[PDB]
Structure formats: C-alpha cells, structure tokens
C-alpha cells in the first residue's frame, strides 16, 4: 500500500533562515496519465486545522506566501521555506492522493530565537474554591525561551513536589516564546496550616531564580 514518511520529525530554525523538509512515498506518486505527482503539503499551526500549501508537488496555492516551495518527483518530495517567519511555526504534513489518500507523520517546525527570561506571576486560591474545600495555587511563567525551565514550590520555606502539575503552551506564533503554568493543589485544611507560598523559576537566562510569593496572612 502507500506509506508516507517525513523527515525530520522536528527541527528549529531562526527567523530569516531556510527550512528544508522531506517526504518519502513507498511508491511513485507520478501519475502516468496526467504526468503529475499527486502529492500535497499542509501546514497545521498550533490549535488550528490543517491548511493547504502546495499540491501536485510544486503548485503553490493562491494566498500562500512565496517563501513556501514544493519540489521533488516520484518517491521523494521536499518543502522548502525561505526566510522563515515566526508565524511559520507549525506541523507540516505531506499527503499522497495517487491511491485514495495517506498522510505522512508530520514535521514539527519550531522557531529558534534569543533566550528570554520568564515573567512570573503567582495567584492564591480563590475564596470560591476554598469554600468547596480545595486550594489551588497557580504560577504563570510567561514568554520565555528556551522551553526548558524548572519550577519549585515552597511552603513556609520548604520544597513541596507532591500535587504539582505543569503545562507548557506551544510556541507563540508572534514572539516565538513559550509559557507554562504550574498549579499546586492542596486541601483547604492543609493550605490553612501554612503561611508562605512561593513559586521559584530557574531558567538558563539567570543563575538567580525568579521568586514570586504570597503570604496567606496578607490576603
């Protein structure tokens, strides 16, 4: 049958540089009747539906920036993006339509940018939540790069790792940064036994962690 494979699985490129992406088919997609390769490329930006970029291997769909170029023939195809822009962050899929249709597994394109320190904000549990017996403490670490970051929670000065869940956004399409949320969930009873709640972010951008805290007595 027709197996589509893409390479690389993922890569990062700085704005303004060239991106090269590959698609292989297990059999030739060159239709002998029409003399065209039945191979299309789709761009799927984070949170969005796929969008057609290129079809018949090299035809750029109307409205698609000229920096996107499809090439290749038979079993091997290439999508090249020149002068990549922050907005080009996406998973790119190739798709054969020579015999029914089959998608490749995608190439994830991330955007390399200058290191950026997170902006850290901490939020105490709301009275609405506490009333029902729960206490979630939230820390936002916004607009940083690279994605790797450490968050530590301290309660009255002591590290706590139990009950902490983290979530990273996909890269931002405008500024190529990441953000992450860290949420520490406690019971109200346990929350009320301590005073100081601290989120500490350590990122390669500083040897000093960014520390945000609040004290329950100050609420």
């Amino acid at each position: 049958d027709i197996v589509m494979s893409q390479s690389p699985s993922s890569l990062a490129v700085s704005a303004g540089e060239k991106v090269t992406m590959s698609c292989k088919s297990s059999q030739s997609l060159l239709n002998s009747r029409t003399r065209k390769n039945y191979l299309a490329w789709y761009q799927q930006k984070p949170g969005q539906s796929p969008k057609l970029l290129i079809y018949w291997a090299s035809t750029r769909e109307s409205g698609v920036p000229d920096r996107f170029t499809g090439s290749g023939s038979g079993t091997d195809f290439t999508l090249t993006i020149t002068s990549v822009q922050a907005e080009d962050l996406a998973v790119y899929y190739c798709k054969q339509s020579y015999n029914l249709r089959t998608f490749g597994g995608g190439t994830k394109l991330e955007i390399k940018r200058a290191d950026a320190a997170p902006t850290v904000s901490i939020f105490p549990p709301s009275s609405e939540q506490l009333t029902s017996g729960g206490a979630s403490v939230v820390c936002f670490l916004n607009n940083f790069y690279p994605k790797d970051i450490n968050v530590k929670w301290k309660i009255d000065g002591s590290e706590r790792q139990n009950g902490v869940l983290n979530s990273w956004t996909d890269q931002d399409s405008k500024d190529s940064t990441y953000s992450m949320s860290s949420t520490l969930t406690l019971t109200k009873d346990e929350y009320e036994r301590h005073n100081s709640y601290t989120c500490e972010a350590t990122h390669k951008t500083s040897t000093s962690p960014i520390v945000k805290s609040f004290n329950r007595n100050e609420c």
Binding site: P50, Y55, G104, F123, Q129, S167, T169
Partner: protein, 222 residues
C-alpha cells in the same frame, strides 16, 4: 466564502456509535469529493475515507483502518456531509475534520473544517469549576498586570476560554489541559496594562460544550 463546520463530537462509551456532521457552504457541494480525516491529540493526521462527487455516483471508499465500521454519506440538498462511526474504541478518540477533496481534476484538499473532538471513554461528563486568578499582595509596578482563569476538574475535553468576549486576544495564553484522576484542568492567563485593570473590567468566558456550561468570571481586585 467557503465554510465547513463539523458538529456531533463529544463523549461516547467504548462500543458505542456516534455520527458526525459537516455543514458546508460557498461552493458547489455536489461537484466535490468530500473526505474525513482524524487526529488523535498530539498525533498525525489520518485519512479515513471519502465520498465521491455526483459525476462519480457519490460512491464511498475507506481506509482499511475503519472500513466496515465507519460509513460516510452526504445530503446533497443541504450540502451536509456525514460520518457514522460504530463500535468505537479509545483509539478512535480524536479530532475529526471534514475536508473538501477532489472535483474530478484538482488533487488537493482545498478546505478543512475546524474539527470536532470525539472522546471514547467510560468516564462521566463533569462540568468545570471556574476560578478567578487575581493578583495577591504585590503591586504591579511591572507596568503590565497578569490575570487568569483556572478551569478545573472537567471531562471530557474541550473547553473554550476567551477574555472579554474575544476583545482581548493579544497577551492571552491558554495552557493545554492536563488529565488527572479522570478530570482535566487548564488555566488561561491574560496580560493587560495595569492602567486598564481594575478600572476596566476583565472577564474570562468559559464554555464546556459537553455539559453546556457557560461561565463568565469577572476578575475582581481587593
């Protein structure tokens, strides 16, 4: 002005059936093959099948992965595409897209819907609790101030979060939901000039379609 809009996604139990619809407009529906494509969260697109155009007798084809179990049909009077799914399993949990396909000449999927999310699970529908995230005790001399919304303990996905009914788009970060104990939690942050809040209102608008939940949570100071 081509429009494709899927509906029908939601929670179904293993072994169950579910039919999706895709309402279309802005093109001559009968001229076009229509495909369904799905995407498990975080995974690749998978083509499922198509139904051919009128010139080709509206006949269907399917990927081996779903042939015999999924059925595609179309209403050519109303320009609606359907996907009937039977004997659903966890591996069928995915976003389902309808896509406009072949018109007898062009080889391309020109247009795709927004997708509808199907969750196959024995877990019960649970509406979110929505909590405001307002700054504690720390003046934002930071020129900018960051507020948030915690959307906790819901099932299944998805939820939608907007800020001031979509008026605030820039400076918004909505964090992917994390699953814990059969329940999802997510949060959303918004960052606005400190001169605009709390003098101006900032409200997160949360919807959880599975429970028809609609919440508008005003972020209040003090």
């Amino acid at each position: 002005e081509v429009k494709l809009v899927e509906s029908g996604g939601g929670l179904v139990q293993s072994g169950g059936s579910l039919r999706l619809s895709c309402a279309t407009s802005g093109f001559t529906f009968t001229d076009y093959y229509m495909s369904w494509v799905r995407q498990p969260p975080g995974k690749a697109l998978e083509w499922l099948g198509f139904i051919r155009n009128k010139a080709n007798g509206y006949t269907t084809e399917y990927s081996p992965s779903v042939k015999g179990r999924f059925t595609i049909s179309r209403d050519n009077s109303q320009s609606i595409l359907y996907l009937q799914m039977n004997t659903l399993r966890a591996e069928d949990s995915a976003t389902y897209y309808c896509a406009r396909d072949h018109d007898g000449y062009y080889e391309r999927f020109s247009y795709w819907g927004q997708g509808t999310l199907v969750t196959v699970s024995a877990a019960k529908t649970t509406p979110p609790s929505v909590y405001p995230l307002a700054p504690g005790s720390a003046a934002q001399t930071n020129s900018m101030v960051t507020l948030g919304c915690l959307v906790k303990g819901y099932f299944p996905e998805p939820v939608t979060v907007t800020w001031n009914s979509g008026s605030l788009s820039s400076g918004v970060h909505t964090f992917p939901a994390v699953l814990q104990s059969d329940l999802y939690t997510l949060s959303s942050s918004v960052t606005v000039p400190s001169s605009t809040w709390p003098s101006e209102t900032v409200t997160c608008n949360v919807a959880h379609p599975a429970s028809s939940t609609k919440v508008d949570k005003k972020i209040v100071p003090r």
